[PDB]
Structures are given as structure tokens and as C-alpha cells.
């Protein structure tokens, strides 16, 4: 199958500020032969929603066409429908929820007609996870197995529930749509029960758009904002989540934020830590920080410098036939070094270790 001989560690970053928000993001192809993730990051929405922002991560599969179309138009499909609009003053929570549901269903059908029309040869599909942030609500949006979480008061206040085929209701639908869930896959093939695209799984005659083997229907949750307590939001594809849990990642990002305010760097650190933890998938993260996101701490920066220096000395002593990096990491791990980044652990310190190793054993 895919898998490069070596991972494409090139980071594609972006950052911005506006509407009281700050953000950074990182996308990296990793070990996969192709890059099928995509994203949207926008502060200030058109048509009278300049106070609104929108961020989303798309994990494409069997191609990037659906993911890419989604990242450039899922938003307008959401905001530009009669349900979201619901012509009145500002959109009510229901307008926003209905607007999003319709946006998903409409862009799905819309891509389907384009494909049928132009004899599209791809059979790709994509997940979508994001947040629609208004001046008073963050509406989490989920469709698939990508995941998002809101850290509030140093804790995981909310996180999206991944749509897996064996989930009771998904399984129910799948079976009623004539399919079966074999272990964790729709008919032994698809590992997600919801996604846009995957039109071959949406041909069950006698079933609605949301009653097919794979559903384009999103789960939306309205969370009232808290200026005082809202810290940050993390949106990432399963390439991240496969190897780091909710509180681990949350704890990890906090530790990195106490050390830097460069949100692109924090995202790169999450991606490399997950690659070092063994993720062999495309990886994408969007970190959106609120006014009360943790701040850089002088003592935290000190402890980091101390740890980096300490790790460099260990390598010097360990490297001494001169063991390969794989083995130096092995030694370091058996030493059970204290004060390693929470959640990220030694893997989050691999670039420091490897940089020293490289200076000492350049050939
Ligand atoms: Mn993919
Ligand atoms: Mn993935």
C-alpha cells in the first residue's frame, strides 16, 4: 500500500489573529504516499458575520478531491442556505444548527451531481470537524472520525464523539441500509460511518440521504462562550488522535503554550510528537486560542532550557561503538527521566535529542 521509505516531515503552517482569537495550524504528510487532509481557517465571515470565525479539518480518503472541495466551500454552503439565514435578525441557535446540517447535505449532493455530470473518476470521501465561533457561542461541528475539543479552565470541557461504524446507532443505520459492520468497518472496508463523498455507499434505494451506509449528517453542539474560562480549541484528524488522548494532548498543548506563543510552532510540536509516537498517517492540527489561553511562563521556559541541556549531556555521555539514535532513545527511555512534557513525554523531546545526536555523530 502507501507508506514512503521515509516520512515527508515538511510542515505547512498558517496563523492569524482577529475577533479576539489567535490561531496556528500545521499539516504534514508524514509516512503516507499522498496528502489527503485539508483545512479551513478563517476569521471574519462574509454576509454580515465578520464577528464570526470558522475553522475545520478534513481528512480525505481514497483521494483528496472531496476534502479539498470541502475546505473551500463547506462554509458558504453552510451560511448560504435558507435555514442558516432564516431571514430575521441574527441566526438563532437552531438556524445555525439547521443551517449546518443543510450545508452538509447540500454540498454532498452538490459534489455528487458534479461528479455524475463530469463523469468524475474519483471515489474519495472526507471527514469534517470544525468550530463556527460567534461572539457568544462556539458551535462544534462533527462528521466522521476527526476530533475537536474545547479546553476550559485547564480541563477538557467538551470533545466531539467520533462516528465509528460499530457505534450502536451507526451500526443500526448501516444494517438497515442493507449493510454490515465487520469488526470496525462498513462491509469490511470503510472505517467511518459518516463522511461527505463515498457516493458508492450512498446508493441504497429506499433510504434517505441520512439513511445510507455512510451518512453526510453532522453532529452540532452549541457551547456558550466564557471570556474568562475559554482557553483553546484543538481540531485534528485521527492521525493526531490515534496516538494521543484528549487530556494528554490538552495537557501537552498547555505545557507548550507556557513555553511559547508561536502557535505554528506549538502545532508543529504536536505533529512531530505524534509522528514520533508512531503515527503513520497524514496529520493536521488547528490550535485556536482565546484571550485567557495559558501564557508564556518565565519559569516554564527555564525548566525547558534546563531539560534540553540535561538531555544534551545525557546524549553526550551515552553516545560515549557509538549507538544509533534508535538506541540512544532506548537508553534515555529506560532512565525514566523526570519532568518530561506531560502527554508528549520523550517523543516530544526527540527533536532536541536528535539535534544533539546529529552534532556528535554527523556521519
Ligand atoms: Mn485520509
Ligand atoms: Mn487519517
UniProtKB/Swiss-Prot annotation:
Catalytic activity, EC: 3.1.3.16
Sites where the protein binds Mn(2+) 1: 59-60
Cellular component per GO, a single term: cytosol
Coarse class of the protein's main subcellular location: nucleus
GO biological process: cellular response to transforming growth factor beta stimulus; dephosphorylation; N-terminal protein myristoylation; negative regulation of BMP signaling pathway; negative regulation of canonical NF-kappaB signal transduction; negative regulation of non-canonical NF-kappaB signal transduction; negative regulation of transcription by RNA polymerase II; negative regulation of transforming growth factor beta receptor signaling pathway
Bilayer topology: Lipid-anchor
Annotated SMART domains: PP2Cc
Post-translational modification, as annotated: N-myristoylation is essential for the recognition of its substrates for dephosphorylation.
Residues annotated as domain PPM-type phosphatase: 22-290
Record Gene3D superfamilies: Phosphatase 2C, C-terminal domain suprefamily, PPM-type phosphatase domain
An example Gene Ontology molecular-function term: R-SMAD binding
Manner of cofactor binding, per the entry note: Binds 2 magnesium or manganese ions per subunit.
Record keywords, A-Z: Cytoplasm, Hydrolase, Lipoprotein, Magnesium, Manganese, Membrane, Metal-binding, Myristate, Nucleus, Phosphoprotein, Protein phosphatase
The protein's role, per its UniProt record: Enzyme with a broad specificity. Negatively regulates TGF-beta signaling through dephosphorylating SMAD2 and SMAD3, resulting in their dissociation from SMAD4, nuclear export of the SMADs and termination of the TGF-beta-mediated signaling. Dephosphorylates PRKAA1 and PRKAA2. Plays an important role in the termination of TNF-alpha-mediated NF-kappa-B activation through dephosphorylating and inactivating IKBKB/IKKB.
Self-association and partners: Monomer. Interacts with SMAD2; the interaction dephosphorylates SMAD2 in its C-terminal SXS motif resulting in disruption of the SMAD2/SMAD4 complex, SMAD2 nuclear export and termination of the TGF-beta-mediated signaling. Interacts with SMAD2; the interaction dephosphorylates SMAD2 in its C-terminal SXS motif resulting in disruption of the SMAD2/SMAD4 complex, SMAD2 nuclear export and termination of the TGF-beta-mediated signaling. Interacts with the phosphorylated form of IKBKB/IKKB.
Protein name (record): Protein phosphatase 1A
Lineage: Eukaryota, Metazoa, Chordata, Craniata, Vertebrata
